[PDB]
């Protein structure tokens with residue numbers, strides 16, 4: 001049986017696959033052709049069909065897991081294409097998490113004799129996050145922050161040590177947002193969540209600009225000026241609101257300048273994309289700040305695929321969390337940020 | 353000099369005007385024609401030009417203020433039309449608050465010999481709120497809540513006593529959102545704020561539906577189904593997410609079903625209006641809940657004109673705050689909710 005961990009989210013399926021690299025001469029003969037075809041298919045291709053992708057840069061090489069050495073691979077595809085995945089399987093013990101482990105349980109059982117083991121998505125997230133940081137990213141730090149995030153000429157990605165990770169606030173930005181407080185390896189809770197997450201960015205962006213992919217939405221946003229759509233403090237006060245330390249550049253009302261018809265007629269799609277990104281990102285940061293204050297936790301780590309290839313939102317979070325907390329909170333990021341649930345699911349294999 | 357209080361916000365100007373009703377025979381002769389023309393103009397019209405409105409239902413009758421008896425009137429017009437207001441004035445001590453008291457200071461001083469006194473918008477809000485509740489709404493309660501907000505066959509507006517109003521969390525929903533913690537008549541602070549407020553509702557609604565007024569946006573929303581645009585917990589899990597008590601009907605991702613092109617092509621403008629309203633309203637409620645928990649305050653009063661003629665958002669707030677706090681927080685509302693800053697400004701007149 002191949003060793004796989006699957007996190008079926010509302011938008012993306014994430015798959016962690018352990019490729020053994022210590023296969024003995026006797027073991028290669030004993031392996032069945034279907035198993036060899038799967039291993040070869042997965043390791044000789046980086047694109048799978050039309051929508052599956054192997055994130056080769058994230059591979060952990062020569063990892064020791066369950067007493068074997070191998071490479072840990074990280075693979076993603078849209079949940080909309082899970083029927084293709086299952087149909088290919090019909091042409092193994094599967095540890096699965098995410099909402100889709102429940103929603104699609106009956107579909108996975110169409111694969112004869114397959115044993116599906118549903119695992120909790122936040123249990124798997126915490127276990128996978130702690131594990132990956134513990135083994136390191138091929139000797140490099142898994143965790144990083146942006147040093148001097150308020151000064152663009154200095155701002156730079158820097159490694160951050162999580163050897164004693166507790167306590168930790170984890171902000172999981174998927175379709176929506178889950179906020180977790182982790183006090184130990186066995187003591188964690190879901191503090192709250194928000195509905196304004198990555199699916200809001202992508203959904204609103206598509207409605208407003210006609211973009212047809214997450215990457216196109218980010219490309220548009222990179223070219224836009226959110227202040228063409230947003231109403232700033234200085235638009236209301238003429239400058240800073242000094243009594244409460246609100247700088248003129250702060251957003252007072254997201255999309256608030258779109259109440260004027262002439263401004264709706266002049267705004268560009270790129271401006272709207274950037275305002276959508278800024279609106280969602282600042283709200284996530286603000287909710288994270290309030291939760292960190294209430295939980296008395298000063299390290300805030302952001303995960304989920306809203307931040308994949310999204311340096312704009314990462315840098316906005318780093319700057320905003322530091323600025324609005326007056327330096328009391330630190331924004332942290334993880335190289336394997338979308339895959340922790342899939343890894344945590346894989347890690348449950350020995351229990352079955 | 354007529355007694356006026358003005359709150360110049362980012363979107364609306366609010367004006368409180370005290371009409372004396374104890375004018376003696378000698379006083380009517382001494383009054384100048386311009387003053388008599390202003391009082392007559394204000395009290396014989398309910399529409400002023402094309403965009404000014406007197407909210408006659410809010411009038412406080414036979415109020416004793418500064419040692420005189422009179423009627424307190426409540427008048428609003430768009431900040432975009434303030435040049436018309438100022439030009440009419442050029443054809444008095446003015447206590448003014450809101451950002452526009454600063455932004456338009458030089459414009460108010462084009463009225464010869466006018467004395468402008470800028471007052472802080474959250475100082476005025478707290479003072480006006482406490483004052484109006486203290487004098488009552490013509491003998492009725494100024495404050496109300498929705499009893500049994502979780503059961504539509506029972507849910508009904510009911511009066512609420514604020515005779516000892518402290519402590520109180522005040523959520524001011526204007527263009528954006530300000531959240532205040534009031535501990536006494538002289539001890540209050542701005543806890544935080546959000547950029548996702550009434551201008552976000554109106555701005556996004558206009559972009560998405562082509563509506564041309566706040567009232568039209570609400571009319572559209574009243575006919576729509578937000579679940580056509582939003583991705584719910586049951587869309588991801590197939591039902592409830594039981595481990596964390598998330599019901600299937602909860603929104604997991606606002607506008608999250610709009611990542612699918614075929615759903616964008618089927619959604620109605622009314623659906624989009626309702627999803628915008630629900631998205632903004634739930635986020636305001638959630639931020640209010642987190643702030644109330646951190647401030648250790650269990651009464652949350654919502655003000656600002658986002659809720660004017662907006663029973664949908666008021667009932668959503670009442671239900672959501674009670675549901676998501678497991679009954680620990682109570683949503684409160686005020687009949688004069690958009691006008692407290694203007695009243696607090698008027699109340700500063702004796703200091704000058």
Ligand SMILES: Nc1ncnc2c1ncn2[C@@H]1O[C@H](COP(=O)(O)OP(=O)(O)NP(=O)(O)O)[C@@H](O)[C@H]1O
Nearest residue numbers: 009010011012173174175176198199214304305306
């Ligand atoms: N290739 C992509 N396709 C779609 N969305 C993408 C893609 N890449 C990045 N994203 C973003 O990543 C978000 C989904 O993140 P992800 O952590 O995989 O959520 P999920 O697990 O599928 N949803 P959930 O059930 O709420 O946990 C989307 O909402 C987008 O904002």
Ligand SMILES: Nc1ncnc2c1ncn2[C@@H]1O[C@H](COP(=O)(O)OP(=O)(O)NP(=O)(O)O)[C@@H](O)[C@H]1O
Nearest residue numbers: 361362363364525526527528550551566656657658
């Ligand atoms: N006639 C109207 N015109 C515009 N907006 C309206 C109207 N009626 C209700 N609204 C809503 O009321 C909101 C403005 O509320 P209001 O409390 O008057 O804010 P403001 O004081 O002008 N803004 P701010 O400077 O942020 O405090 C708008 O964003 C709309 O959502």
Ligand SMILES: CC(C)c1ncc(CC(=O)N2CCN(c3ccc(C#N)nn3)CC2)cc1F
Nearest residue numbers: 233252282285286320321324528529545546547
């Ligand atoms: C008084 C009126 C005109 C008014 N209404 C609303 C606002 C918005 C506001 O108050 N804020 C503060 C909190 N903020 C963030 C952002 C990111 C993070 C992170 N990470 N944290 N906080 C968002 C904007 C301003 C304002 F002047």
Ligand SMILES: CC(C)c1ncc(CC(=O)N2CCN(c3ccc(C#N)nn3)CC2)cc1F
Nearest residue numbers: 176177193194195585604634637638672673676
């Ligand atoms: C696990 C994944 C699939 C997921 N991701 C996000 C959510 C959203 C969420 O967690 N919530 C709770 C807080 N909530 C409100 C709303 C109003 C108030 C008031 N007043 N308070 N809270 C909003 C929705 C669900 C969810 F299953």
Ligand SMILES: [Mg+2]
Nearest residue numbers: 009010098174
């Ligand atoms: Mg997920």
Ligand SMILES: [Mg+2]
Nearest residue numbers: 361362450526
């Ligand atoms: Mg205001």
